[PDB]
A paper describes a structure:
ExoMA1 had an optimal pH of 5.5 and was specific for the α-d-Araf bond. The crystal structure of ExoMA1 was determined at 2.42 Å resolution in the apo form. ExoMA1 assembles four trimers to form a dodecamer. ExoMA1 monomer has a double jelly-roll fold, which was found only in GH172 among over 160 GH families. The active site is located at the interface between the two subunits of the basal trimer. One phosphate molecule per monomer was bound to the interface of ExoMA1, which is responsible for dodecamer assembly. Other GH172 members (αFFase1 and a hypothetical protein BACUNI_000161 from Bacteroides uniformis) had been shown to form distinct quaternary structures depending on the mode of contact of the basal trimer. The dodecameric structure of ExoMA1 is formed by the interactions of four loops above the double jelly-roll fold, whereas the C-terminal helix is mainly involved in the hexamer (dimer of trimers) interactions in αFFase1 and BACUNI_000161. The corresponding residue in ExoMA1 is Asn253, and its side chain blocks α-d-Fruf binding, making the enzyme specific for α-d-Araf. ExoMA1 has a unique dodecameric structure compared to the various quaternary structures of the GH172 enzymes. ExoMA1 hydrolyzed the terminal α-d-Araf structures of arabinooligosaccharides released by EndoMA1 and EndoMA2 but did not act on MsLAM, A22BβT, and A7Bβ.
Author numbering:
A (entry chain L), B (entry chain K): 2 to 371
C (entry chain A), D (entry chain G): 2 to 370
The structure:
Amino acid sequence: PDLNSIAALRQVQTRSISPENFDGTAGGGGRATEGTGADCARDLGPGWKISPSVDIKAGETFELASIEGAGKITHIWITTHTDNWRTLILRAFWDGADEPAVEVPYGDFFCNGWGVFAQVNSQAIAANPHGGFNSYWPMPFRDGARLTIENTSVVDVRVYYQVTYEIGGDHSNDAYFHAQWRRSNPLEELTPHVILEGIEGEGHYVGTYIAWGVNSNGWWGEGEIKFYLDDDTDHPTICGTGTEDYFGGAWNFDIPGKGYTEFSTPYLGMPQVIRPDGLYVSQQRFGMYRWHLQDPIHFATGIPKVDIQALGWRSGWRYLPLRDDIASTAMFYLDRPTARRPKSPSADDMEVHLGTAPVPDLGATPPRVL
Amino acid sequence: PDLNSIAALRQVQTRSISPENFDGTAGGGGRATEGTGADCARDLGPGWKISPSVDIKAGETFELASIEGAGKITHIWITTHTDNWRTLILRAFWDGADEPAVEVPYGDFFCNGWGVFAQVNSQAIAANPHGGFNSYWPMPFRDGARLTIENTSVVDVRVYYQVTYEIGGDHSNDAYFHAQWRRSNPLEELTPHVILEGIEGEGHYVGTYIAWGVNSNGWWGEGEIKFYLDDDTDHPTICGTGTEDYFGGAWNFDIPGKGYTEFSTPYLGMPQVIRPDGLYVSQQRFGMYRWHLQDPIHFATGIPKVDIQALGWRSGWRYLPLRDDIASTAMFYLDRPTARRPKSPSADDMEVHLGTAPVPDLGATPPRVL
Amino acid sequence: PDLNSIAALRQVQTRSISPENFDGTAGGGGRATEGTGADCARDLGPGWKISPSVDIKAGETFELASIEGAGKITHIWITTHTDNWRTLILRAFWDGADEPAVEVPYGDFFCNGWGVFAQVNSQAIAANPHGGFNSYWPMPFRDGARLTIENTSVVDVRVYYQVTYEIGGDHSNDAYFHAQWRRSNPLEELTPHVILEGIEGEGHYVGTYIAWGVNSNGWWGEGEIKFYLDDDTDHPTICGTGTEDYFGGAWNFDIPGKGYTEFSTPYLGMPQVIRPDGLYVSQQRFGMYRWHLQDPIHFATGIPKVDIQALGWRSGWRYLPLRDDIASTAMFYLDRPTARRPKSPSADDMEVHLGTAPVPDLGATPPRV
Amino acid sequence: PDLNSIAALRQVQTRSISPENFDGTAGGGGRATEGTGADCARDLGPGWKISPSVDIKAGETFELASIEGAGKITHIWITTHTDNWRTLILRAFWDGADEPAVEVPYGDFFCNGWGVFAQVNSQAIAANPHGGFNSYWPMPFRDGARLTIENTSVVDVRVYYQVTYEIGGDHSNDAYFHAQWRRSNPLEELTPHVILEGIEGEGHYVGTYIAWGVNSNGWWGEGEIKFYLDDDTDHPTICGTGTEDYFGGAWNFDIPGKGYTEFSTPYLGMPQVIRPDGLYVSQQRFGMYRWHLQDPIHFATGIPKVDIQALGWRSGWRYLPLRDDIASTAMFYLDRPTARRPKSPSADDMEVHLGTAPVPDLGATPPRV
């Protein structure tokens, strides 16, 4: 429900999967006698926070949640240290499918793909101090749900999480939640950055998060977003007017006398502006989201292409093709649990620089000395 | 309705009770010739802000709103000076019930339990400069409604209010809105702070505001929330992983280089961080809220217990049971107009220090000096 | 002697026990070839700071001093790191007794019960940069003395110390030095904090140090101190008028426009004000001492009770009973080497949070991790 | 006793007189059911700070302490709001005498004659935040003692106090404590300010506190102190070399690059420097004390005169006789309970401006409007 409909009596059950209730059973929480907090509770009884988190060994995948039957995820809360935001891969599989519908680097799913905490005050995503990541995207499913997180790094990783969902609804006409990630670094000359390609089915596009690192001086966001829907081949159905325009800003996000200004509204934001520090943090980077909740982009047959140009300015008032560092996360609902995906994100494609030192390992927490 | 459904035509009437229209009648507003504004308008006349507020004498209860028939409150606005935020009790009675379904200290109901204004940008609660307290919790009723505000303080109190409601909808399947408040100060050793106890009926839990003052050094919010629903006894169905975790945050609310950081999002917030001033304002305090609107916690026959652990840190990585000052406000919808309640809040249990002086009466507005 | 009487020739001997002369014997100092400094002097010979300190293993007790016969301790210097100020227990045993007359956490004995250095300029106690702890309380004894320090913590600790004493002169009529510790956290509703209880004998009360952490807003120091002496039962002989009053301050220690002001005088002080930093050091705390040296509180048959009220302010000009964090150290002289004392301090009720980080182990030196 | 002698056992009783124990009797404290704190304790039970203070109505005198028999006051603690430091007169009468031995404005007794708080860390006098006034001057008597506070102001005042004393000692060769006050505003030209005059008996001079407000530019402390003792007539036995000199400073109290510097040591101090604010607080004022404790100034048959010159500088390296505002408090011990005194201080001669506003009533707490 929502504020408007919260009062209606509904025959629904609410369940919640955490490290204190791995399977989310009724009456099954807080029973652990082993866990990451056991030694901490050694002078207290059982039931005093024995199992708040899990450790995922380097290279391994952990099953956050396994649900049987029909249901709908209504709220995901999760945290881990910033160092892992671009080493963990978050995946969701609906209805027993062998391929995931959601396959995203952890940080980007919460508009935090740079490993530097940015506050996000939106409706679908809340990202709160410090690295408290919340997803309210409804994720309904008809015949099972699997959520996993893969630690592609060389170090062991600690993760806290809480997956809340509903049982007892009819999801026969609910679509499946999908999310996909692509990174161009550096984008090829005069080539749009692909956001989505080759999606088949009925559904609607509902979200874009972009992490953009700029390699040219001047304004970098002239490029237009383009939605090729259904029958479209060589020209899109929805064509935009700029990068900041798409994300609801205008005129370079530039408030006279203040510069680039972070903002974060229910459907539109640029929650992140990273400014170089004159030493080893040398890349100017941006994070921007737009949710199409009141204005979804429906498609009856498919989405052949969603892409966005990367244009700035050069002398003589000419557009400048940008060789920039662009990562997109596209959110969409579909009447199937799988669709064409890009190649799985590798450790190497995902990597951003860890700290503020000259070497990632020197600014990791704690530093890595080998 | 909401933004998505606001265009639809509906056979519904809107009414609003205020000191300028005490009973809400149509054509009934602005007729006062006596009131708190009458002398202010002695050179004007009737119709020029004659009756904007009410004066509630010390000890006495004022009936904000009496409504007959079926209806639904859609928006409450109310204000009063900060000195009264923890001396007034807000109450709501549905369907002619002898007992209140809402029984809350005034400030807590708007996430402001400490008497120090804090901005709240949430969906259900908006608290604005300076002490503009707004509630958008829908409160449906089938056979009448009464709202009251009790002045438990030794001074007369001024209150402005605007209670907006609808007539003409079907509430036979709408739950009733409830809210309950409990404070433990200091929390007993090894004792979860009880948020909600013994609720019988069908319904769903939708909101927590906690006012927390900390009596140990170090981090204070390791403790987990536990929801015992339906048949639960010894173990909860939903077990949390931490106090900041439950409220959408992570890692102590601690942004590196900034410390505790206030935030306020549609469903999650720590709107308030009170820092000691090194003189008479010596208690470090927090206010936190979570609304379970997209993700309500349902129950079919009851809520035996909701509670939250108060755990900090001791040497040797040991949880420290905290003897802290913890006040909780719990919001839930129920299919009955009454339910098991804590003891009624009293002047002594609600009291927080007034102002910044060594004596509450010195810092009151105006100073009492009696 | 003192400044007034220092010129007099006296048939007295001065000795001094330190890690460089463990038994304090004439000509016994500086002989070590092993000790905590030996390797530091590997390129120098012996006699170059070979044994300046001792290491005390986790859990273990170390005998600082053992003196045979009659004497008087005249000055104790001692130091150790911040993290050990509320983990070490200092004890003194007089005349071969099995029960100690002094049983006090290390830091409280030098007005430093919070593990944060505060300068103390008093006559009996001098606490100097950084953690140079000095006691000049004279401690006479007739038939032996033992000083011990117990490491109740889980780590090993370094201690430097120097215990200076005198042999000669009659302690026929010199009382014994006693010191006892009690902490209420949180204090019971509307209940005085006990400072001293059930003491029997002849003597005089000479010292109070209190470490006070406040859990209510407003002014916390209205409570009066009360001395029940000799035949007293339900009412005291000496009844104070406030907490800051007892400690020689007034009007909340609050100098207008500057707030709480630390001071330290020969007999009266508030040497420590700890203000919260708005992050993990969230407790506002105080350190206060009064030495009754020119104005001893005598008793002839005992001290039934010494207590102090914990009172602040509530709405309506009402006292507010304070559920506060109060630790007291009482100093008194007694005509017996033993007295009835509280339950020994444990590691747990002594513990104060270490450092400024979210977990004590993260703020320890070095971090425990 | 003191630190050097604190350990000795002594057949002495300690008593303390306060608003909570008006007569100091054993088992007598904390019994009140009426008092200034009774309404404050209305929600608590008996014994919770019912009687911590006294209200002295405008114009009236209040008897702080009345003691019968032999005894010795060992410590006085007292406080009241700064507005009253120069409207209250503190008096002490020994052995039933009809005239006081101590007759001093309240603030001056504690080196605070200007109504602006100044820390004093001295041996005999401790003045602590904010207005905690402490005297450790021992005051022996042989046949009773009376301590009074006179409120010469037109408003009611609140006082908190604690008078601690001993019984048991033999005071038959203990002198009586005396203190006297004299103000010259403005001092007549080329006329020494009289500190003490015509004292008859055996004793010793033990203290000077001077409150000095300067009405000429340049350095104001050239003038030197003179003690006329015993058979002295036209010339003194002790002749000092300067005003800062007498108070233990040198070269104008002026540290290069810092100006006048406050300091408070066990016997010597300039605890107070008051700098004009450029508006209504326009008088540059100083507070200075010297205790002659280790160096008492002895007399066998009396003190004809103690005085001090007020000399500054004019052009041509000539002394400038100063028309200055000089109040002194002389402490001395005498073998008699009474001595020759100045006129009692009046409200008008004691008055100092209250606050910082144009009119004293506007700067009082609260304003008298």
